[PDB]
């Protein structure tokens, strides 16, 4: 017998959005300089031919795939001119994000003790390193497959891919071949870039604040333990694990909405709910920023 | 000169060019499956690119040209397949899939207070197999087409702006009330969505649905008696329908086999019991509850 599945290339779509810039005044088409998209790591993506939707609105697309779950700054050099001859003496700047706006998904736990694999995968998929995880061949292939088809897979196909991925993760050295484990083991199998706060600073918060540039994910192994409110730079906090005692859940933020994902249960949460999350066993162990 | 930036990921076209996969129950001999056939819900054959074997059990191919959106497609593996155990297939094998989203639906705010009908109709139209024909029709206001294309991939703020523009352009149309509450059918008339009046020839709504022309997907239920969820025929292909609670419209839409109730901006997942409990008409008024039903 045969089973048919459809895998739409929507992730790659998220990597080549169609950006649109609307201006306060009518702009002269030939004043528009070359627009550059720039990332938090310094890399610049070029912008394709400009299409004018109105005397004020222009539309373009990155020349090359942008990174996933990454923030990008649109830089319009100085020199644009209005239809009245005015000029912009300053580079104009805006921003956007290559992340999904739809709500997170739930990953089943058919093992009974696969909480930690699911939580770690939830934190990784919402991670700025998802593209970097997906390119490392040393990573089990099935995990990469689950992480690329995450948002766009039938639940049935997501469930089969998850079974195969859990199988391949337990097959690794770092991860238990059976039974429960730790989020850190799965992240190490994923080759996720983390910043141990023991390296460096004296506490977790100071290492997060006084960390090298472009450090997004932190592993909190210093003292004191932190709660949600203690996490620095809340404006960029996008994911973090929470440990309820032999059970891991994920807290992941999408399009300004926080969600709590316990295996296959996605439930939306507000900031006040999060602020009640205590720190005591470490509660928050991995904190992922954008 | 200041700027406002928006990001619209090309998710709609992505759904129209999927990569299809067939997994088999047993290891298959690579040379036993030489040609697979893709066919559309109208029977037309769609051309397919090279066949790729990802494993002894899994094959992967891709449409040559964009498929239609929110549309069903049937895959046939011809007879002659052979397993590694010598077995053979005396009959052509068949499966199916649809180019529709698996993501959960979105919510549309109602700042008007009486724009329930616009939101409900747009929700039904976006889950329609005729979405491509609506988006290509120049007679439909351009803001509405933009909203219907950016439905799944737009920021909540950007979707809200698009919705304001779409409601504005809709109320301006002849079909739709310039102000105040209204009816789903007026929005469908503006969108020019193909509808099949069951009052037209048939004796019941359901019998008109069953004995309808081929490839009739959207129905306007204007015969007697009114139908409940259970009375609607062919539940297996039902993907959307409206529900009217008395001057207030909600939508019921199915995605990846899961039904959702969208009351303006409130998306809530529902089970079969909730639907089977939905009444067919109000006792005092006598008003039809479900009037538009959309199939795949």
Numbering used by the authors:
A (entry chain B): 194 to 393, 396 to 475, 481 to 490
B (entry chain A): 193 to 393, 396 to 490
Sentences reproduced from the published study:
The betaproteobacteria Burkholderia pseudomallei and Burkholderia mallei, causative agents of melioidosis and glanders, respectively, encode the TssM effector, the only known bacterial DUB belonging to the USP class. By solving the crystal structures of isolated TssM and its complex with ubiquitin, we found that TssM lacks the entire “Fingers” subdomain of the USP fold. The structures revealed the presence of an N-terminal immunoglobulin-fold domain, which is able to form a strand-exchange dimer and might mediate TssM localization to the bacterial surface.
This construct comprises the portion of TssM predicted to be structured, and upon crystallization revealed the presence of two globular folds: an N-terminal immunoglobulin-like domain, followed by the catalytic DUB domain. The asymmetric unit contained two TssM molecules forming a possible dimer with a contact surface formed by the Ig-like domains, with some contributions by the catalytic domain. A single β-strand formed by the first eight residues of the Ig-like domain is swapped between the two adjacent dimers. The two chains are almost completely resolved, with the exception of residues 193 (chain B), 394, and 395 missing from both monomers, and residues 476–480 being disordered in chain B. Both chains have identical conformations and can be superimposed with an RMSD of 0.63 Å for 3,221 atoms. The DUB domain assumed a papain-like fold with an active site triad formed by Cys-308, His-442, and Asp-457. This discrepancy is owed to the fact that the TssM structure lacks the entire Fingers subdomain, which is in accordance with the major deletion observed in the multiple sequence alignment within the respective region. In TssM, the entire deleted region is replaced by the short helix α6 flanked by flexible loops, which appear neither related to other USP domains, nor do they structurally correspond to canonical USP elements.
